[PDB]
Amino acid sequence: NWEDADFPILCQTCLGENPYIRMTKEKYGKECKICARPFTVFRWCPGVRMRFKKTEVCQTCSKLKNVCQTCLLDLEYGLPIQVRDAGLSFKDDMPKSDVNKEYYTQNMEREISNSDGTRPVGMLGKATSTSDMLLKLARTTPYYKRNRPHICSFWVKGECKRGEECPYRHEKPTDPDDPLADQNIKDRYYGINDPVADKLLKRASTMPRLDPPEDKTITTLYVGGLGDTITETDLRNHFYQFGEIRTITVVQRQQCAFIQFATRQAAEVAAEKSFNKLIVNGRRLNVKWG
Amino acid sequence: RKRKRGVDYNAEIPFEKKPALGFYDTSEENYQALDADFRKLRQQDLDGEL
Amino acid sequence: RVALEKSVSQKVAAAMPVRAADKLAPAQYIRYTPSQQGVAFNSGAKQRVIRMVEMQKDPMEPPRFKINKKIPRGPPSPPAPVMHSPSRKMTVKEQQE
Amino acid sequence: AKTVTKQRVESHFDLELRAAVMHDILDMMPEGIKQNKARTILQHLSEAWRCWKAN
Amino acid sequence: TAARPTFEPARGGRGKGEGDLSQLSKQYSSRDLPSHTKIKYRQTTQDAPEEVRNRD
Amino acid sequence: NMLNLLIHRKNLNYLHLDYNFNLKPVKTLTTKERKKSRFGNAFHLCREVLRLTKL
Amino acid sequence: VHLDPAVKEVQYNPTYETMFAPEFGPENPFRTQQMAAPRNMLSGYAEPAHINDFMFEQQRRTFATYGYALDPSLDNHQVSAKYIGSVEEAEKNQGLTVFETGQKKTEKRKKFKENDASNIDGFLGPWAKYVDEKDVAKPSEEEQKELDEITAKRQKKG
RNA sequence: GUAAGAGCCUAGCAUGUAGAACUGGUUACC
RNA sequence: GUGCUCGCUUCGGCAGCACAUAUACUAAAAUUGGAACGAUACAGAGAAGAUUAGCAUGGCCCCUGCGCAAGGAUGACACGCAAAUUCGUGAAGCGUU
Ligand SMILES: [Mg+2]
Ligand SMILES: [Mg+2]
Ligand SMILES: [Mg+2]
Ligand SMILES: [Zn+2]
Ligand SMILES: [Zn+2]
Ligand SMILES: [Zn+2]
Numbered sequence: 079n080w081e082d083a084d085f086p087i088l089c090q091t092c093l094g095e096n097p098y099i100r101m102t103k104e105k106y107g108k109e110c111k112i113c114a115r116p117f118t119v120f121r122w123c124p125g126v127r128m129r130f131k132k133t134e135v136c137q138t139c140s141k142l143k144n145v146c147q148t149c150l151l152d153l154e155y156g157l158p159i160q161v162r163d164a165g166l167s168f169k170d171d172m173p174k175s176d177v178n179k180e181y182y183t184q185n186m187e188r189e190i191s192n193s194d195g196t197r198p199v200g201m202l203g204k205a206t207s208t209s210d211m212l213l214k215l216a217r218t219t220p221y222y223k224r225n226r227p228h229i230c231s232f233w234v235k236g237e238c239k240r241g242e243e244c245p246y247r248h249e250k251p252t253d254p255d256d257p258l259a260d261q262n263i264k265d266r267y268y269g270i271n272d273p274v275a276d277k278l279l280k281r282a283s284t285m286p287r288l289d290p291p292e293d294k295t296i297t298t299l300y301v302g303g304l305g306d307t308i309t310e311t312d313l314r315n316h317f318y319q320f321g322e323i324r325t326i327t328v329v330q331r332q333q334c335a336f337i338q339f340a341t342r343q344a345a346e347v348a349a350e351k352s353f354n355k356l357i358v359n360g361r362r363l364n365v366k367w368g
Numbered sequence: 369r370k371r372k373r374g375v376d377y378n379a380e381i382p383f384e385k386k387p388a389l390g391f392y393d394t395s396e397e398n399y400q401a402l403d404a405d406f407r408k409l410r411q412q413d414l415d416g417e418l
Numbered sequence: 419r420v421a422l423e424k425s426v427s428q429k430v431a432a433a434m435p436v437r438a439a440d441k442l443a444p445a446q447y448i449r450y451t452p453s454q455q456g457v458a459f460n461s462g463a464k465q466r467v468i469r470m471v472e473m474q475k476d477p478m479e480p481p482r483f484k485i486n487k488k489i490p491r492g493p494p495s496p497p498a499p500v501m502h503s504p505s506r507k508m509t510v511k512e513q514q515e
Numbered sequence: 516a517k518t519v520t521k522q523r524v525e526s527h528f529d530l531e532l533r534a535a536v537m538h539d540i541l542d543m544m545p546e547g548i549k550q551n552k553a554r555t556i557l558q559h560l561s562e563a564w565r566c567w568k569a570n
Numbered sequence: 571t572a573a574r575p576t577f578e579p580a581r582g583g584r585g586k587g588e589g590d591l592s593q594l595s596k597q598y599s600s601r602d603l604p605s606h607t608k609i610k611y612r613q614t615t616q617d618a619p620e621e622v623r624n625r626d
Numbered sequence: 627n628m629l630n631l632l633i634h635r636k637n638l639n640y641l642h643l644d645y646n647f648n649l650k651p652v653k654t655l656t657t658k659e660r661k662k663s664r665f666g667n668a669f670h671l672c673r674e675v676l677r678l679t680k681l
Numbered sequence: 682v683h684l685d686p687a688v689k690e691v692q693y694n695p696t697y698e699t700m701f702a703p704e705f706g707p708e709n710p711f712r713t714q715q716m717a718a719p720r721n722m723l724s725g726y727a728e729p730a731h732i733n734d735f736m737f738e739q740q741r742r743t744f745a746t747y748g749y750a751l752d753p754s755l756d757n758h759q760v761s762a763k764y765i766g767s768v769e770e771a772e773k774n775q776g777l778t779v780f781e782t783g784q785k786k787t788e789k790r791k792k793f794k795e796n797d798a799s800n801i802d803g804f805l806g807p808w809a810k811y812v813d814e815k816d817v818a819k820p821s822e823e824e825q826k827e828l829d830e831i832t833a834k835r836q837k838k839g
Numbered sequence: 840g841u842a843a844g845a846g847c848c849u850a851g852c853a854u855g856u857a858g859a860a861c862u863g864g865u866u867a868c869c
Numbered sequence: 870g871u872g873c874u875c876g877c878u879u880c881g882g883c884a885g886c887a888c889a890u891a892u893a894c895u896a897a898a899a900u901u902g903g904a905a906c907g908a909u910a911c912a913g914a915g916a917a918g919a920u921u922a923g924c925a926u927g928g929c930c931c932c933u934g935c936g937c938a939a940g941g942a943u944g945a946c947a948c949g950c951a952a953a954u955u956c957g958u959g960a961a962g963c964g965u966u
Contacts, residue, residue, distance in 0.1 A: 079590045085470075087724045090452055090459040097466040097753060097765060098741035104473035107894085109483060111857075116483050121894075122468075126745055130895060134857050141723060150857065153724055154454065154715045158858095173384075175376035177489060177929050181383055185492045196722055206711050217860070219458050224858070231899035233820065234828050241818040245895060248818060250827070254834055258859050266858065274859065281860075302865070332866055364864085370846080373929055385493060418950060429591065433602055447732050449753070453718040453725030461744075462765035465754040467730055469737065473894095485593045490929060491584060508547020516585075518937050526925040533575060557575070571948045572915055576926050599937060635852090637905060658842050658932095659906075661941065666934045742891065780890065796870090807870090835899095840913080843945080851904045855896080 079187065080106055081117035083137045089146040089153060091220035092131055094124030110136045111263045113183055128225040135267070138187050142172065143267070144198045144205070149224065150266050155216045159267065160275035161282075165212040166204055174268060211282050214354075288349030292368050297324055297345035299337035303364035306330060316358055320344040436477060445471040536560060629673055638663050647677040743778045 082105065093099065099122050107119030111134050121132040133147035140147050143159060152162050173179045190199055198205055230246035232238040238248065252259055257273040266272050291297075310328050313335070317323055325338025339345050352365050369375065376382055451465050460466055519527045540556055586592045612618040630643045640652050641663055649670075655663070683699035684691070691700075708717075721727050732753065744750040749766030757763075764771045774784055793809040810816075820828070 080593055085448060085450070085468075085722070085727045087722070089724075090454060090456065093452075093466070095461045096741065096744050097460055097463050097750060098737060098744060099466060099468045100471070100741070101468060102471050102473045102894095104894090105475075106482065107473070108856095119894090123895095130893085131857085132894085144723075146724075148857065154713060157860095171380075173376075173380050175379050177373050178376050178380060178382060178384075180487075180489045181492065181929085184489060188492060196720070198723070205713065205716075208713060215860080218456070220456070221860080227895080228855095229899085230896085232897070233818065234832065234899075236819055236825060236828075237817075237897090239817050239897070241816045242814050244818075245893090246898095248820065250824075251831060251899095252859065253831060254838065256859085261858050263857060272858090278860065329867080334866075376929095383490070388496075429587070432591065432594070432596075433598060433604060435596065447730040447737065448727050449730035449755070450728075451718070451720075451726040453715060453720045455714075455718075460765075462768070463752050463754060464757050465752075467732060467737065467753045481596050485595055486931095488584070488929065491581070506546045508545070512545065513547065516937065520938075522924060522939095524924090530576065530925070534579070537577075553577075572943090572946090574926070574947075578927080580927065597935090600935070601937060637852090639906065656842080656907085661842085661933065662906095664933055666936095668935060738891085745891080782886085842942095843912080843914095845911095848909075849905090849907100853903080854901065855894090855898085856901095 079115065079184070081115070081136050081138065082106070083118055086118075086120040086133045086147050087137060087140045087153070088133075089149065089151065089156065091156075091222060092124065092146055092148050092225065094122070094128065094225065095220070095222065096125060099123075110134075110139055112136075112139045112267050113179075115180075115183070124225040125222070127227075128222075129227050131225060134263075138183070138190060139267070141190060141199060142170065142186060142201075144201050150263075155212050157212055157216060157278060158269075158272050158275040160269040160272045161278045162212060163269045164275070164279055165210040166208075168269070169204070170200060172268065174264070211285060214285065215278060215282060286354045288346070288351075288353035288365070289367060290346065291342055295342050296368070297337070297339040297342055298368060299335070299345060299348065300366045300368050301335035301337065301363065302333075302366055303362055304330070304333035304335050305359070305361050306333065307361065308359045310335070312358070317348065320347055439477050440475065442472050442474065445469065533557060629669070629676070632669070636663075643673075647673050647680060649673065739778050739780055742780075746779050747774070749776070 084103075101120050101122035104119040104121070106116045109116045113136050115136065117133075117136040119132055121130060123130050131148050135145075135147050135150070137147070144153055144162075145151060145159060146153060151158060155162060173182050186199065193199070227246045229251045230238050230244055230248060232240075233244070233246070233248050234251065238244055257276070260273065264270075266274075269275075310326070314323065314326070317337070321340055321344050323337065323339050325336070327336035327338075329335065337345075337348075339348070349365060349367070352363070356363050356365075447467055447469055449465055449467050452460060455464065517523075536557060537553060540553055541550075544550070582588065586595065614621065629647075633641055633643060640655060640659060641649060642652050643649050649665075651663075682702045684695065686704060715724075719726055730753075740750040740753075744766055747767070747770055749764055749768060749771040752763055752765045764776065777784060790811055791813065792811045793805060795803055795809075796806055798804050798806070819825075
């Protein structure tokens with residue numbers, strides 16, 4: 079089918095830093111880079127020195143995979159699709175071969191048009207269960223360096239006869255001796271071998287995490303960074319969630335708090351939930367084993 | 369290879385319908401793949417006797 | 419009748435494509451709340467206002483894309499239960515006749 | 516949706532006759548029939564037409 | 571084989587006006603030009619439903 | 627330009643439209659090339675209208 | 682305290698007490714920032730505004746020229762007004778727009794003029810180039826060699 | 840005994856894309 | 870940029886005011902893939918002996934044609950070890966409770 083929708087699905091670092099945006103709507107302008115069925119192309123200018131970005135994929139190919147239509151990054155977290163599927167499950171399995179892709183597209187678009195038109199169709203129930211490591215490397219500030227005109231290919235040959243009037247950049251292109259420079263559109267879409275996603279998951283592997291007990295059954299918790307502006311009667315209230323809490327040794331001369339629970343399971347938990355995440359009394363509460 | 373369809377058979381499930389799900393959890397259980405045994409297996413063996 | 423006449427007009431618009439070729443300026447505004455608020459993301463605001471102009475279509479422009487492509491018919495809606503009677507009994511003699 | 520113009524007329528008639536016979540034998544068989552045996556009745560009808568033409 | 575009967579028809583709903591007007595083609599027959607673009611209605615002497623309603 | 631862009635888009639490189647709007651084959655055509663390059667009344671009628679205007 | 686939370690389009694004229702009382706109870710924990718915001722289609726809430734053309738494009742060009750503008754939000758944190766942008770230059774230049782006579786007037790650029798149309802191959806009315814900035818931009822002394830290196834590395838691939 | 844592949848077997852017409860992620864921790868009793 | 874300022878006040882400059890207010894599918898490109906007959910070998914046209922008119926039917930097969938005409942070999946394909954639910958007798962020999 080065609081698509082024919084109003085107001086595209088965009089993030090905030092592609093839609094520009096101006097709250098006042100002019101965009102044009104073309105009814106069936108291009109085809110999708112994934113679906114190859116034609117859609118409504120929206121085209122705007124992000125800012126002042128930017129590139130005139132436009133939407134690349136359908137409303138449907140962004141409903142299936144919860145991304146922005148031009149940068150193909152997540153709407154909520156802003157990370158590549160392979161990273162978000164790595165920090166979640168992968169149960170979409172969109173077909174890549176031709177006839178199966180258009181058949182699956184027709185049927186999932188029928189499922190979309192047999193619904194409200196507001197939610198991620200299959201990604202919702204798995205989007206309830208969230209806040210993995212992907213929340214701990216999500217970019218806080220907008221990356222406005224994407225919205226930036228291409229390298230002038232006449233200036234690379236030293237023949238840019240426009241000079242100062244050329245809107246294209248006179249600066250270095252990136253070295254092709256780089257994994258970060260292949261980057262197919264469909265490889266970035268389907269979550270297959272995206273090198274940006276490789277570097278983000280590698281950064282992710284390094285990152286701090288809750289760990290297992292050195293010895294069996296030990297529910298002893300070695301808590302560093304307590305501080306003397308807190309009270310131990312509240313800890314219990316913020317801890318009871320887990321189960322009956324075993325031993326609760328308290329030391330304020332090192333500001334370390336040792337804890338004990340019935341089962342080791344609960345102690346692992348309290349690490350997991352607790353490690354590099356929990357803060358109470360506006361003060362970070364750091365945890366270790368033994 | 370110069371053809372539109374045809375390579376879609378081994379690559380994936382062709383016109384896949386998911387089995388309808390309800391009233392019983394069936395997310396844990398799985399099936400075991402076939403033994404390869406590529407030192408006895410023949411084209412007649414997969415097909416069965418005529 | 420109001421619902422059907424609209425689809426009638428949309429079907430009939432194909433019959434004469436350009437006799438009095440089309441005219442377009444309802445350039446409009448939509449107020450959009452981004453729903454992924456950040457201290458620095460919009461710049462500094464909860465909302466943003468976007469002016470949409472419909473792109474002006476070339477009269478001397480042929481169709482853009484191939485439409486003749488065809489895929490097999492998808493699954494139908496979930497099967498309805500049959501609500502039949504209890505299988506009137508069949509005899510060997512009538513089965514043979 | 517091609518039109519039955521002049522060279523499709525006998526083929527369309529004999530296409531629709533078979534369909535009417537198929538609907539009638541699907542309605543005429545009782546409840547416990549194996550729902551096979553349509554092709555044989557269609558062959559009996561073609562042979563009955565040949566025997567009508569041959570007198 | 572080649573010469574064979576049907577035993578099932580071709581289904582409708584997959585061509586030129588069936589779901590999305592076959593994705594809005596720009597091809598149209600000469601039988602699809604405007605023609606008889608005005609429904610004639612029954613007049614008072616012919617058999618208008620006002621006159622048919624009270625009749626025994 | 628319109629008529630030979632229509633020729634060159636249909637990959638009919640073995641035909642030639644001269645400047646007086648005669649359509650001639652460059653070579654001797656096969657059966658498949660002759661079945662492929664057979665135009666209808668629209669192309670030829672527009673070509674002959676253009677021949678009259680060029681006269 | 683009298684009406685359904687959201688269905689839409691009330692047929693009777695409501696009261697402020699019967700429509701804008703808050704919802705009772707605690708929020709459910711099963712929703713994210715995207716799911717808790719009152720979004721309309723997958724990325725936020727889009728509704729048809731009716732802003733004046735001149736005022737819209739005034740604030741738009743004011744941001745695009747300087748970097749500040751007024752807030753087009755409906756309520757936001759309740760308050761009559763505030764500015765959104767690089768806020769420091771708004772109160773610096775007293776919050777002027779592009780369509781108004783400016784405060785700053787200094788350092789104008791210099792260009793040619795031969796406005797007579799009598800000297801052939803000497804006339805340039807509004808096509809006058811600047812006297813300071815110049816055409817074709819050859820890059821540098823080492824930029825050329827490193828671009829030759831990167832094109833040579835491209836040549837080693839195909 | 841000619842367009843029917845298949846393959847070849849060499850070509851050619853569409854594209855003006857999207858995308859480049861970097862930050863760190865203490866020890867102690869009978 | 871131009872004009873007006875009972876503007877400084879000369880014909881030099883400056884000030885004020887008025888009118889004038891956002892082009893560009895941004896490349897003269899770099900790229901990226903799928904593609905021109907047609908030649909190369911092979912290859913040979915359905916209907917139970919042979920020589921043959923054809924009209925259909927079905928769809929992830931198209932071409933020519935403005936065609937809901939008509940052609941394309943009856944346009945091609947279709948040719949299938951065509952196995953779908955569910956069994957019982959009688960004696961005979963051998964071992965067993
Ligand atoms: Mg025919
Ligand atoms: Mg014949
Ligand atoms: Mg046929
Ligand atoms: Zn799409
Ligand atoms: Zn984006
Ligand atoms: Zn340049």
